[PDB]
Scaffold this motif. Sequence first.
Motif, PDB file in Angstrom:
ATOM      1  N   UNK A 134       0.985  17.394  12.668  1.00 47.29           N
ATOM      2  CA  UNK A 134       2.298  17.697  13.219  1.00 47.29           C
ATOM      3  C   UNK A 134       2.781  16.561  14.115  1.00 47.29           C
ATOM      4  N   UNK A 165      15.438  23.418   7.956  1.00 49.63           N
ATOM      5  CA  UNK A 165      16.634  24.245   7.858  1.00 49.63           C
ATOM      6  C   UNK A 165      16.610  24.975   6.522  1.00 49.63           C
ATOM      7  N   UNK A 214      20.453  29.184  12.656  1.00 53.01           N
ATOM      8  CA  UNK A 214      19.304  29.110  11.761  1.00 53.01           C
ATOM      9  C   UNK A 214      18.685  27.718  11.713  1.00 53.01           C
ATOM     10  N   UNK A 215      18.998  26.871  12.694  1.00 49.20           N
ATOM     11  CA  UNK A 215      18.392  25.556  12.825  1.00 49.20           C
ATOM     12  C   UNK A 215      17.435  25.441  14.000  1.00 49.20           C
ATOM     13  N   UNK A 220      11.635  34.977  10.981  1.00 46.22           N
ATOM     14  CA  UNK A 220      10.889  36.211  11.252  1.00 46.22           C
ATOM     15  C   UNK A 220      11.594  37.416  10.633  1.00 46.22           C
ATOM     16  N   UNK A 234       9.558  41.242  10.212  1.00 46.84           N
ATOM     17  CA  UNK A 234       8.781  42.438  10.542  1.00 46.84           C
ATOM     18  C   UNK A 234       9.255  43.656   9.752  1.00 46.84           C
ATOM     19  N   UNK A 285       4.720  34.356   9.660  1.00 48.77           N
ATOM     20  CA  UNK A 285       4.363  33.688  10.898  1.00 48.77           C
ATOM     21  C   UNK A 285       4.525  32.188  10.709  1.00 48.77           C
ATOM     22  N   UNK A 286       4.165  31.425  11.738  1.00 53.27           N
ATOM     23  CA  UNK A 286       4.275  29.973  11.669  1.00 53.27           C
ATOM     24  C   UNK A 286       3.148  29.351  12.480  1.00 53.27           C
ATOM     25  N   UNK A 287       2.273  28.605  11.808  1.00 54.65           N
ATOM     26  CA  UNK A 287       1.129  27.970  12.446  1.00 54.65           C
ATOM     27  C   UNK A 287       1.312  26.474  12.662  1.00 54.65           C
ATOM     28  N   UNK A 288       2.133  25.825  11.828  1.00 53.86           N
ATOM     29  CA  UNK A 288       2.704  24.495  12.064  1.00 53.86           C
ATOM     30  C   UNK A 288       3.485  24.017  10.845  1.00 53.86           C
ATOM     31  N   UNK A 289       4.786  23.808  11.025  1.00 51.51           N
ATOM     32  CA  UNK A 289       5.635  23.141  10.030  1.00 51.51           C
ATOM     33  C   UNK A 289       5.666  23.998   8.766  1.00 51.51           C
ATOM     34  N   UNK A 313      14.861  28.795   2.692  1.00 58.17           N
ATOM     35  CA  UNK A 313      15.976  28.615   3.617  1.00 58.17           C
ATOM     36  C   UNK A 313      16.987  27.675   2.967  1.00 58.17           C
ATOM     37  N   UNK A 362      20.956  27.467   3.161  1.00 59.33           N
ATOM     38  CA  UNK A 362      21.896  26.873   4.090  1.00 59.33           C
ATOM     39  C   UNK A 362      22.190  27.762   5.279  1.00 59.33           C
ATOM     40  N   UNK A 400      13.857  44.054   9.673  1.00 61.64           N
ATOM     41  CA  UNK A 400      14.826  43.485  10.585  1.00 61.64           C
ATOM     42  C   UNK A 400      14.761  41.950  10.524  1.00 61.64           C
ATOM     43  N   UNK A 436      14.488  38.460  13.607  1.00 63.70           N
ATOM     44  CA  UNK A 436      14.280  38.131  15.015  1.00 63.70           C
ATOM     45  C   UNK A 436      15.015  36.838  15.319  1.00 63.70           C
ATOM     46  N   UNK A 481      19.077  40.210  17.609  1.00 66.14           N
ATOM     47  CA  UNK A 481      18.678  41.003  16.455  1.00 66.14           C
ATOM     48  C   UNK A 481      19.938  41.538  15.791  1.00 66.14           C
ATOM     49  N   UNK A 484      17.514  48.179  16.040  1.00 65.43           N
ATOM     50  CA  UNK A 484      16.610  47.481  16.940  1.00 65.43           C
ATOM     51  C   UNK A 484      17.349  46.378  17.698  1.00 65.43           C
ATOM     52  N   UNK A 501       1.771  29.929  20.099  1.00 67.19           N
ATOM     53  CA  UNK A 501       0.767  28.974  19.661  1.00 67.19           C
ATOM     54  C   UNK A 501       1.304  27.577  19.930  1.00 67.19           C
ATOM     55  N   UNK A 543       5.975  25.524  19.622  1.00 68.27           N
ATOM     56  CA  UNK A 543       6.767  26.351  18.728  1.00 68.27           C
ATOM     57  C   UNK A 543       6.272  27.798  18.730  1.00 68.27           C
ATOM     58  N   UNK A 544       7.114  28.689  18.228  1.00 63.73           N
ATOM     59  CA  UNK A 544       6.895  30.112  18.422  1.00 63.73           C
ATOM     60  C   UNK A 544       6.247  30.764  17.210  1.00 63.73           C
ATOM     61  N   UNK A 545       5.426  31.774  17.497  1.00 64.49           N
ATOM     62  CA  UNK A 545       4.749  32.570  16.490  1.00 64.49           C
ATOM     63  C   UNK A 545       5.354  33.955  16.326  1.00 64.49           C
TER      64      UNK A 545
END
Lengths: 53, 93, 211, 228
Positions: free
Chosen positions: A27, B1, C25-26, C31, C33, C46-50, C63, C65, C84, C86, C97, D45, D101, D112-114
């Motif tokens: 990253x 994006x 959205x940039x 997310x 759920x 989820x997102x752990x990196x990139x 994603x 536009x 939903x 987030x 939301x 929600x 994380x 960045x967010x999880x």
Amino acid sequence: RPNNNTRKSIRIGPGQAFYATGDIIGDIRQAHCNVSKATWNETLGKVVKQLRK
Amino acid sequence: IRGELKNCSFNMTTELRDKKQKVYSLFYRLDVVQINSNKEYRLINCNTSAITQACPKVSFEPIPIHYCAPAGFAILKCKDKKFNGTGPCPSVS
Amino acid sequence: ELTQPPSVSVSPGQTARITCSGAPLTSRFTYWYRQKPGQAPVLIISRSSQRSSGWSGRFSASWSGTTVTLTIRGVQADDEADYYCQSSDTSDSYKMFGGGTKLTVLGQPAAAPSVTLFPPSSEELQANKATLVCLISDFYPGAVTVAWKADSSPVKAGVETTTPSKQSNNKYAASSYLSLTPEQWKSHKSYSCQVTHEGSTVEKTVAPTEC
Amino acid sequence: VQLRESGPGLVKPSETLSLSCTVSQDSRPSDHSWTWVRQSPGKALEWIGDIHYNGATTYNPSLRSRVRIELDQSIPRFSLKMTSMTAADTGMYYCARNAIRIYGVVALGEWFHYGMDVWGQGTAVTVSSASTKGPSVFPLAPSSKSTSGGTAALGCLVKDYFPEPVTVSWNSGALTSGVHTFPAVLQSSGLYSLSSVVTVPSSSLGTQTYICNVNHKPSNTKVDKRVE
Ligand SMILES: *[C@@H]1O[C@H](CO)[C@@H](O[C@@H]2O[C@H](CO)[C@@H](O[C@@H]3O[C@H](CO[C@H]4O[C@H](CO[C@H]5O[C@H](CO)[C@@H](O)[C@H](O)[C@@H]5O[C@H]5O[C@H](CO)[C@@H](O)[C@H](O)[C@@H]5O)[C@@H](O)[C@H](O[C@H]5O[C@H](CO)[C@@H](O)[C@H](O)[C@@H]5O)[C@@H]4O)[C@@H](O)[C@H](O[C@H]4O[C@H](CO[C@H]5O[C@H](CO)[C@@H](O)[C@H](O)[C@@H]5O)[C@@H](O)[C@H](O)[C@@H]4O)[C@@H]3O)[C@H](O)[C@H]2NC(C)=O)[C@H](O)[C@H]1NC(C)=O
Ligand SMILES: *[C@@H]1O[C@H](CO)[C@@H](O[C@@H]2O[C@H](CO)[C@@H](O[C@@H]3O[C@H](CO[C@H]4O[C@H](CO[C@H]5O[C@H](CO)[C@@H](O)[C@H](O)[C@@H]5O)[C@@H](O)[C@H](O[C@H]5O[C@H](CO)[C@@H](O)[C@H](O)[C@@H]5O)[C@@H]4O)[C@@H](O)[C@H](O[C@H]4O[C@H](CO)[C@@H](O)[C@H](O)[C@@H]4O)[C@@H]3O)[C@H](O)[C@H]2NC(C)=O)[C@H](O)[C@H]1NC(C)=O
Ligand SMILES: *[C@@H]1O[C@H](CO)[C@@H](O[C@@H]2O[C@H](CO)[C@@H](O[C@@H]3O[C@H](CO[C@H]4O[C@H](CO[C@H]5O[C@H](CO)[C@@H](O)[C@H](O)[C@@H]5O)[C@@H](O)[C@H](O[C@H]5O[C@H](CO[C@H]6O[C@H](CO)[C@@H](O)[C@H](O)[C@@H]6O)[C@@H](O)[C@H](O)[C@@H]5O)[C@@H]4O)[C@@H](O)[C@H](O)[C@@H]3O)[C@H](O)[C@H]2NC(C)=O)[C@H](O)[C@H]1NC(C)=O
Ligand SMILES: *[C@@H]1O[C@H](CO)[C@@H](O[C@@H]2O[C@H](CO)[C@@H](O[C@@H]3O[C@H](CO[C@H]4O[C@H](CO[C@H]5O[C@H](CO)[C@@H](O)[C@H](O)[C@@H]5O)[C@@H](O)[C@H](O)[C@@H]4O)[C@@H](O)[C@H](O[C@H]4O[C@H](CO)[C@@H](O)[C@H](O)[C@@H]4O)[C@@H]3O)[C@H](O)[C@H]2NC(C)=O)[C@H](O)[C@H]1NC(C)=O
Ligand SMILES: *[C@@H]1O[C@H](CO)[C@@H](O[C@@H]2O[C@H](CO)[C@@H](O[C@@H]3O[C@H](CO[C@H]4O[C@H](CO[C@H]5O[C@H](CO)[C@@H](O)[C@H](O)[C@@H]5O)[C@@H](O)[C@H](O)[C@@H]4O)[C@@H](O)[C@H](O)[C@@H]3O)[C@H](O)[C@H]2NC(C)=O)[C@H](O)[C@H]1NC(C)=O
Ligand SMILES: *[C@@H]1O[C@H](CO)[C@@H](O[C@@H]2O[C@H](CO)[C@@H](O[C@@H]3O[C@H](CO)[C@@H](O)[C@H](O[C@H]4O[C@H](CO)[C@@H](O)[C@H](O)[C@@H]4O)[C@@H]3O)[C@H](O)[C@H]2NC(C)=O)[C@H](O)[C@H]1NC(C)=O
Ligand SMILES: *[C@@H]1O[C@H](CO)[C@@H](O[C@@H]2O[C@H](CO)[C@@H](O[C@@H]3O[C@H](CO[C@H]4O[C@H](CO)[C@@H](O)[C@H](O)[C@@H]4O)[C@@H](O)[C@H](O)[C@@H]3O)[C@H](O)[C@H]2NC(C)=O)[C@H](O)[C@H]1NC(C)=O
Ligand SMILES: *[C@@H]1O[C@H](CO)[C@@H](O[C@@H]2O[C@H](CO)[C@@H](O[C@@H]3O[C@H](CO)[C@@H](O)[C@H](O)[C@@H]3O)[C@H](O)[C@H]2NC(C)=O)[C@H](O)[C@H]1NC(C)=O
């Protein structure tokens, strides 16, 4: 510098080889410098004491 | 994006002068600038002066270099710890 | 302040499409759920990196536009609830939301009642109000009337009913209750309830004689 | 790893409300940031305020006039306040952890967010004035149609209570092989009338006739009653 640069050598004619940044691994992280805030506060203070006179 | 480097594609000569080749490369920002949908860029130095690549196996690490005098000459050292600007130094070597 | 489709339906075992449209959205991904009836949401994605985010749990997302896509996996059997969205804002401040979707799988059979009615017995009828425990459950969808009778003909009468709510695997429930005085329970007739969904619907008789 | 909400669950239309969320068994809850949410009765929600161990507060601008969130310093157990605006806002409120994380260096912008990964048990709150009356313990009875095993009808219904939440258990929490719970309506009077049925194997029930918790809700009035 946390960036993991790969070496990409591409020849531009003979013997000559341009060394381009390859593709990054990991990253993207901005380069940084650490300064001991404790050590820095006193060095900046001794100067204003000498500059006082 | 998060975006400060750019994936550059460009057209460049190969080993044979006749043929050409297209390869990608990454460059840092400010080292390249736009010209006028698809962005178009140019190296910031091609506008100004020429360019030459640094040698691949060359160390830019500063190592101690000593300056020393020629025969009949001598270098004088100010051994006075407090030496406001410059003035008469009582402790010379 | 975003847009989400509230109701999409698709075939089971087939792929589905969820959207959430908005301007920021940039700044921070998407997310979603999922909200089961009476349960807490769980991380759909989820997102752990990139890029390594959607990948291989199943699902997967795209994603384009302005709006983003939640291209879910092939099998869609029974994994049905409300979804939903987030995400955060361009200035990272606050989170919006904008509602979301409730998907339903087709091909499942129709209603089939199988709950016995209960009468008030002991403890209640000796206080001041015997009241009327007149309940039934297990059905989908709702809108079936219980029509409590006075002797053998449905008296409209005067007591409340509950709006159906889903539980476990769909199954609208919530049942229906009644409330009369013992001066009508211990004085009119023998009482009996009915069920009128469609076609064939069966039910049970009441009668007292506990003592 | 786990966390549950805590606090009172009703409010008069005026005044403020206090809800607290305790978290335990977390291996490192300092860096992780926390938040509250709500679900209106119309199944819509929404989001409320971010809070972190550093001391950063920012809540929904459509709610900033009322909400003020605080984090306790000694142990992890944050709280949420809501001032004037409280009517209709009620329904049920959740406690969730905004998973953070981190991949680089903090204070630079590499965090960045999880998103939400662990939520609370989920508590419910409604504003409607009035007070509670308490449950009236009641049995609905069975019928011995046949000696042999078949479908079983059981009952332990209760007519009154004011708070919408409900606590019911069978044999004091032993066999939930066939427990059921169905909501009730306001029946105009205000108090709801929730009943709970269980479907356990019936054939010969002598000493193990099962029991009902009846734990009550705003005022705890646990009335364990056994069926015959
Ligand atoms: C100048 O000063 C500055 C000071 O600002 C220095 O900055 C520092 O820079 C370094 C990097 O040079 C940076 O290190 C980065 O650390 C992060 C975080 O890792 C640490 O914390 C982890 C979290 O532990 C929690 O989770 C684990 C696993 O679940 C549990 O076991 C723990 O108990 C704990 O669990 C709690 O939290 C989780 C999450 O909320 C909850 O789920 C739990 O319930 C519970 O609450 C630790 O695991 C980790 O420890 C490991 O490594 C350390 C160090 O080697 C070691 O001591 C320890 O024994 C252990 O083995 C750290 O303590 C790293 O994320 C980051 O890079 C690594 O991950 C990157 C991203 O994730 C990658 O992998 C995932 C996995 O799939 C993948 O999906 C992603 O795609 C991605 O590839 C990855 O890119 C890297 O390659 C690494 O793998 C760094 O290591 C410091 O944070 C930073 N310091 C500060 C204060 O900012 C700077 O260096 C100085 N310059 C100098 C020294 O010259
Ligand atoms: C102000 O002064 C400071 C201090 O001098 C100065 O900072 C120094 O900057 C220079 C560069 O300008 C640094 O030198 C570079 O080091 C690179 C990284 O390797 C370093 O660390 C190695 C650690 O070795 C230990 O651990 C390993 C296992 O991890 C173990 O095998 C070893 O035995 C040892 O226990 C160290 O080994 C290495 O250098 C020596 O040893 C290796 C083999 O072990 C040998 O290959 C080296 O030639 C050397 O004998 C080094 O210290 C290093 O990569 C880099 O270039 C060399 O390696 C590259 C890699 O491909 C080659 O391509 C290239 O041909 C070179 O061989 C270079 O040596 C130096 O480390 C900094 N500080 C220190 C600690 O001295 C600041 O720059 C100054 N200020 C300014 C203006 O910047
Ligand atoms: C800086 O910029 C440089 C710019 O070059 C970056 O380097 C580039 O990185 C990209 C990353 O995407 C590379 O793209 C890769 O291309 C290879 C090779 O192409 C083969 O596969 C293609 C597959 O289609 C792609 O797109 C579809 C769109 O949905 C995807 O679904 C799919 O996964 C692929 O990504 C084929 O089109 C192509 O055609 C021939 O073979 C086909 C084989 O079957 C493929 O397609 C069928 C459908 O027809 C699929 O069912 C099947 O699964 C498979 O995908 C055949 O069908 C077709 O008829 C043809 O015969 C090739 O086989 C892909 O393998 C990778 O997946 C990816 O797309 C660029 O190649 C790469 N640049 C160079 C030098 O080539 C650099 O990454 C960037 N900087 C960084 C960050 O590093
Ligand atoms: C910045 O990027 C660079 C480029 O990726 C990183 O450089 C590599 O990083 C990895 C991970 O940190 C290092 O660790 C491992 O090295 C192992 C050894 O490979 C070298 O020696 C091999 C000799 O035989 C070994 O592999 C064979 C199988 O081929 C085994 O049978 C045998 O038992 C030995 O284990 C050579 O064959 C090989 O060419 C290397 O010279 C690798 O085996 C190991 O590979 C795993 O991970 C790979 C991804 O890195 C993955 O593609 C493989 O499938 C496998 O899962 C792994 O590479 C490397 O030593 C290191 N060097 C090089 C030149 O590759 C650099 O680490 C990174 N910086 C950071 C932040 O880590
Ligand atoms: C590198 O050096 C090149 C050459 O000097 C620079 O010029 C561009 O090179 C790219 C290729 O990388 C050209 O784009 C390609 O054009 C292909 C065919 O071009 C011809 O038809 C085009 C219209 O397409 C129709 O026909 C094709 C036939 O294959 C069909 O596939 C299409 O569906 C259409 O029916 C005409 O516009 C063009 O003039 C030709 O007549 C095409 O098949 C490829 O898909 C691709 O589009 C590009 O046209 C070249 N010129 C331009 C205007 O840039 C190049 O710029 C240098 N480096 C860079 C910056 O890339
Ligand atoms: C190589 O190409 C580069 C790129 O064009 C060129 O460097 C450019 O030089 C021009 C000289 O005018 C720079 O333009 C200036 O930019 C600065 C910084 O943004 C502005 O402050 C300047 O003035 C602006 O504001 C003034 C306020 O009084 C106005 O009066 C004035 O009209 C301007 O609005 C002015 O725009 C340009 O920014 C640089 N580009 C860089 C380096 O970013 C260079 O000169 C070329 N070299 C050659 C080949 O001669
Ligand atoms: C390091 O220390 C050195 C040793 O002290 C400094 O050298 C001194 O530098 C000053 C200024 O260059 C020299 O002269 C001074 O002049 C002022 C001005 O005098 C006039 O105005 C005053 C009122 O403002 C008035 O009273 C006088 O009559 C004059 O009209 C005097 O006030 C000073 O007393 C002094 O004479 C010094 O002679 C010089 N000292 C010597 C001989 O070394 C040096 O400046 C310091 N800094 C650096 C960077 O080296
Ligand atoms: C520069 O990066 C280095 C690590 O590469 C940091 O060096 C480490 O700094 C810590 C500061 O607490 C040192 O910790 C203590 O060092 C003393 C000896 O001075 C030792 O007795 C203690 O047990 C403890 O280790 C650590 O040793 C030191 N590492 C080395 C070998 O230098 C350094 O702090 C960074 N610069 C800044 C801005 O702090």
